[PDB]
Amino acid sequence: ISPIFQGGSYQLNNKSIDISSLLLDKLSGESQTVVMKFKADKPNSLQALFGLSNSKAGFKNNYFSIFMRDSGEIGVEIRDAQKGINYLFSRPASLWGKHKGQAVENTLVFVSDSKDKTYTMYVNGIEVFSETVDTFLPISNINGIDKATLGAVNREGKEHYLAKGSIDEISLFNKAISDQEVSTIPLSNPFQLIFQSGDSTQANYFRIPTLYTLSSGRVLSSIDARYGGTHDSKSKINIATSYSDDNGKTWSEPIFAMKFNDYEEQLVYWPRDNKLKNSQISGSASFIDSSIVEDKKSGKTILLADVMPAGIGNNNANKADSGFKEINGHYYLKLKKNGDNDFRYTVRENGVVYNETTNKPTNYTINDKYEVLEGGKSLTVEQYSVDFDSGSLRERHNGKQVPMNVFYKDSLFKVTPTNYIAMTTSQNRGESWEQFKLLPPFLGEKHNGTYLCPGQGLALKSSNRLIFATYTSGELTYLISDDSGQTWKKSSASIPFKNATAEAQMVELRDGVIRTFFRTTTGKIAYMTSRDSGETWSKVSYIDGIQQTSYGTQVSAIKYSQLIDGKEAVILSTPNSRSGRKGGQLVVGLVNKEDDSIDWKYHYDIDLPSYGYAYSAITELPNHHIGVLFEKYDSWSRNELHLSNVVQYIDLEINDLT
Ligand SMILES: O=S(=O)(O)CCNCc1ccccc1
């Protein structure tokens, strides 16, 4: 249907615009849709874009508004004091402010549906909330509405929630338009989605993006496909990948690089209320924090990620146990059988389950998928699904049998409840992945494994050496392979932090010279340098000119192929804020060839200093543009958990940065 009202080119300069005479007598029936294209690159702390109100004395709580915050949050209020209704629906991190130094036109669609008693908000093609209520309040059925306002809400004759911005287009319809119709509305987005709710992963949430440019020109991305909200492990999380063959313009439907089947792959709307938001899937195995490298020699793509057995995360992982037993020079995965109090088994060569107590082999084997076989026959367990039907999180058997895996809760043989690192490879540049293999322990029998640094591994340009940074208490532990990832050794580098989440990413400044940038607990990004391809490492220094919070955020980094201002360039991606995960920047550093010091010369603001920016991935695309895949929200904040479609991709050119 056509709109009942359509207007545009409204400048909101801290002074509301009255459109009552144009709009109010057009509103009819109980269902409405608002479509608004607007910019706000300098918003006030809290501002209303659109209002319908009773402006009379004594009715200050009788209004409908669409409002936004300078955090990027969008919402509505629907209030009628006589009816005793005060609805407030919102979602943080729903907006864009600026892109390449120009105000972004956001496309907002709000649907108020009296038949289904549902209010739904979309911004930039993304559904940010949908709420059904028992008692529906039609937005123009508020008692005594007499004002329709842009850029404020008129309460008792005065302008509340004054806005700074512009409304380039606004249309209203006397209908609740369908989800289908909504998808036909043209967008002006500065970003793309690679992974998204409803795609092949069936995860409603994503965190921990990676990007890596392959020698063929294909660009590969990996990510945590997070099912149980945005919570870290313990949860259900798989590792998913997608690639682009056209410099990031289009992306393939995701596949899994690493997945477990003990719990169903469910798209769930995780509760965001204060009573339930900490609900966490507690009996599932998971993968978390992936990293990618390409090996020139074999041509293989290699992906590592952490592996968590059922119910395990970084807080409950046994720090005093590697999960392997050393038996005369070699490491074997330990197992515990149903009914035993101790781990009396190991997995030996060709997956043979061996009884340590009587030194006898059993009739059980572990296959390449870490599944349990008895006499060559596959054992199974019943799968779990999760629901909130009862008003709290329930995890329950769903009738489906899946192969019995030693990382599962229901398995006959169970691994040590600690954290592991696994590796998988692809021979077809991400079209398919092999079954993963566990890496051996590097810090001994009675030390839990290190944690992989998400993002990229490093393929040294002048050799066959591959390095993945990892972290643990008191050091970075670099994992080094010179044989296409068949065998690994560690190189340890002490850091002056205990229990830091020291997520580290590397750039090769010149042949054999590696600088590693890493997250600390000091509010400053740190770095160290190797001049012998990772064998030995310098002391730790800090970057001035960038701020992080006390808890820190992952930082991504690449060595740009082209000179900038006649110099070798490194590009860092990080939030720049001492307050939260916001104020995203790309920072271009120029290398001084005399001492390898870096002059951090240009800071490019990804979006507003107040808008969210957390973990990130950056890569030089084959056409020398820069691709950035990043968490566009505060992934630390307890107010911004469980948001969909906030991991987003943008394309930048060096000219945009400098
Ligand atoms: O809290 S955050 O800084 O956003 C993310 C930190 N994830 C650490 C982790 C790594 C591996 C397993 C569990 C937890």
UniProtKB/Swiss-Prot annotation:
Disulfide bonds: none annotated. The active site is at D232 (proton acceptor), E503, Y615 (nucleophile). One of its GO terms (molecular function) is exo-alpha-sialidase activity. Substrate binds at R207, R519, R581. Its EC number is 3.2.1.18. Pfam families: BNR (PF02012), BNR_2 (PF13088), Sialidase (PF02973). BNR repeats lie at residues 242-253, 424-435, 479-490, 528-539. Keywords: Glycosidase, Hydrolase, Repeat, Signal. GO terms for cellular component: cytoplasm; intracellular membrane-bounded organelle; membrane. It catalyses: Hydrolysis of alpha-(2->3)-, alpha-(2->6)-, alpha-(2->8)- glycosidic linkages of terminal sialic acid residues in oligosaccharides, glycoproteins, glycolipids, colominic acid and synthetic substrates. One of its GO terms (biological process) is oligosaccharide catabolic process. PANTHER family: EXO-ALPHA-SIALIDASE, SIALIDASE. Belongs to the glycosyl hydrolase 33 family. This is Sialidase B.
